[PDB]
Symmetry: none
Subunit: 193 residues, 4 copies
């Protein structure tokens, strides 16, 4: 753990930031708890390690680290393993906090999200909200037809998510375009209900 050092070195930097801007005690509570959930004691340049290795090693390594997330992922557990690997290599780990608006209706959407751990409300205007939890995913609609978000999605609890940007989503469905209808169908169901 020299990555224990970094966490502290970098959190010291954030306390001087909060100081300098005199953020209210609540806000500092949030920043601090987030930072704890997100880095969980440690900071490292994961991407620059993987950057140093071959593509196959990256793929092996990523598959190991994510075999749990995958088995617990309806859409991956079931799919061609190569599609899975390619999706996995493009996933960015993200944390959100109770009450956070992950997607705001009307926005232009740049990411879509996968639920590793957490619960989330999907709020459309005029109707009862619905929920999504571990295993599900949202935000694919705007990725399919560039466009304004169709619903707001608010974290109901701490959420550990993996995002996928619009470019990477496109890159992947270019690689595995047989997999686009699978997202289209889901978009479609969601849009009529």
């Amino acid at each position: 753990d020299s990555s224990r050092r970094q966490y502290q070195e970098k959190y010291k930097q954030v306390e001087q930031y909060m100081s300098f801007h005199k953020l209210p005690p609540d806000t500092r509570q949030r920043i601090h708890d987030y930072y704890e959930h997100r880095y969980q004691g440690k900071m490292f340049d994961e991407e620059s390690i993987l950057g140093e290795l071959s593509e196959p090693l990256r793929e092996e390594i990523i598959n190991f680290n994510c075999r749990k997330l995958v088995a617990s992922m309806p859409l991956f557990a079931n799919a061609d393993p190569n599609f899975v690997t390619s999706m996995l290599t493009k996933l960015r780990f993200e944390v959100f906090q109770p009450g956070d608006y992950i997607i705001r209706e009307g926005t232009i959407g740049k990411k879509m999200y996968f639920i590793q751990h957490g619960v989330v409300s999907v709020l459309t205007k005029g109707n009862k909200e619905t929920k999504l939890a571990d295993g599900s995913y949202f935000g694919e609609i705007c990725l399919l037809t560039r466009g304004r978000r169709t619903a707001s999605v608010r974290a109901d609890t701490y959420c550990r998510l993996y995002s996928l940007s619009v470019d990477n989503f496109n890159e992947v469905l270019e690689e595995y375009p047989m997999m686009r209808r699978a997202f289209e169908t889901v978009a479609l169901d969601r849009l009529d209900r």
Copy 2:
């Protein structure tokens, strides 16, 4: 206060540069004062801190940091908080010196500006000068017309500004179509006199 030391250390290399170049006394006094006024003893990797946090937190922090600018701005007076946040996250801090031309008539423009603090004169070939100060904005005409600057704008005092690029303007206005009218109105009234 490593921020304090970073500021003495960075101004040292600026002291280096000025020397290796024989910068006239006048110039080097403008640079030093600029430096003092813009960094004010403190030099830190703020964007690097902000980048370690979630979007929701960047929003909460920015909204707090800027609550006084927002308060001083007729444009945000009665508006959707999300529109406001959206605007804030795309503004960039700038500082100009007495005498500086922030905008020249007849030029291609891709930036507008929101005055946080200071006083600016608006010059038009053939007319009386007017002035603008805390809370106002300028350079929206060009962003609307996509043509050229219809007037020059010169700082009368040290100005603390927040610029906003045309791409950013249009994106925000895409998400918040109703706010396009606010800018047209102010532009037109400005042009009707």
Copy 3:
């Protein structure tokens, strides 16, 4: 050698990485081995240095550095000195392990490959496997017709390769268009066989 130390220090970071993710013994051995072949005890910023020099110097160097690769290389010998220089400057060094799939049939190809040192099996579906080594190249067919990979290519031994992106490939034949044919020629004997 100061950049012996680099290798030695960065690898310790690779060590913390494998520990943190509890990677299988076989995976760790594989990484240890890859990192050993790829860097040979020595890590330093190449890009950063060639970056500091003029283009003509960069070219004087790459030509010298790679004369033995060029010698080994049939397509180069009878080609323009300038074509050879322009290709070298776009080549990226990449290492594969025994067993690694370099190219997988059916994938979208964005790269082709020249073999400094390696042996590689070429496996077309339901018919006789073939090999390629030092001097040879593969992955050309795809960059030629912007379609899918017509064979898989697996690495028999450690493979020291120089890759070349589609954009880059395109760039160069658009400059020396005489030279496209050479690839087309080697592509077509391969397709009909």
Copy 4:
């Protein structure tokens, strides 16, 4: 100045690179010498200093820094001074050596060059050499006709050049369409002689 430090540190790193790849004594001499001419014992990060100041300061600094260059150029003689500034802020300093081909005929050009100090020979397949020096420029033809290099341009002496990319070139001219014609004039003159 730790920029005398940087220089040594960065130059020590070139040496290790040179030893490592075992470059013939002549190649080493040219590297060594380029480096001395290009950096002249000092290494700092210009771009990041100017990067910490306002646009009007950059413009004042540059206009000073380049008054001889400007003085030296017929082009800039009776030019709208805001156009000179616009050109100036987009020039990148470059060094070349006796014998360097700055431009090879037939290549696809993406830059043009303004001679600060140096003599260059201009070679046309068939015709006789001519020479350009302090205060002249070359490379514009390709920029005006997004096409091939109509001539080679080799350096007779050490040259201190300022290059302008086609993007910046097309931007300055978008801003100043009048000026595209000063360039066409010379281009045509040079083509028809």
